[PDB]
């Protein structure tokens, strides 16, 4: 499966899962994956960015 051929969304999540599992195998040296703090803290990053965006919009409404 070379090239830019099409892919299904179930493959997109399947790859993202294997990427996270490989990242956990890289930073830690365990692959038991029943809980994963990597996701939790990138969600915390997402919360930071979305909060900055929201406050930026709340700043736009003043004139």
């Amino acid at each position: 499966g070379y090239g830019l051929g099409l892919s299904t969304r179930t493959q997109v999540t399947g790859y993202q899962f294997l990427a996270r599992r490989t990242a956990m195998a890289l930073t830690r040296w365990r692959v038991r994956m029943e809980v994963e703090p990597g996701r939790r803290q990138v969600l915390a990053v997402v919360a930071s960015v979305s909060a900055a965006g929201v406050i930026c919009l709340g700043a736009l409404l003043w004139s």
Binding site: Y2, G3, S7, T8, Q11, V12
Partner: protein, 71 residues
């Protein structure tokens, strides 16, 4: 040809020499490399996203919006 700006000339010759060269590099690289399903889905969606906005832009060009706002 219409504009006499040397900056326009430089941009034109730059795109003429890079863009088909970029196409050549894509033709050489792409059939041999593997790719992630995410990048493949991104490349699919690039099509629809570049396809969708051309009708509002076309109506911009006819100034249908400006005609109908004042009719």
């Amino acid at each position: 040809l219409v504009s006499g700006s040397p900056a326009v000339l430089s941009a034109g010759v730059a795109v003429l020499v890079l863009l088909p060269a970029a196409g050549l590099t894509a033709a050489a690289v792409v059939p041999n490399t593997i790719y992630s399903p995410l990048f493949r889905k991104i490349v699919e969606w690039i099509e629809y996203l570049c396809l969708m906005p051309i009708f509002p832009l076309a109506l911009w060009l006819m100034n249908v919006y400006e005609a109908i706002r004042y009719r």
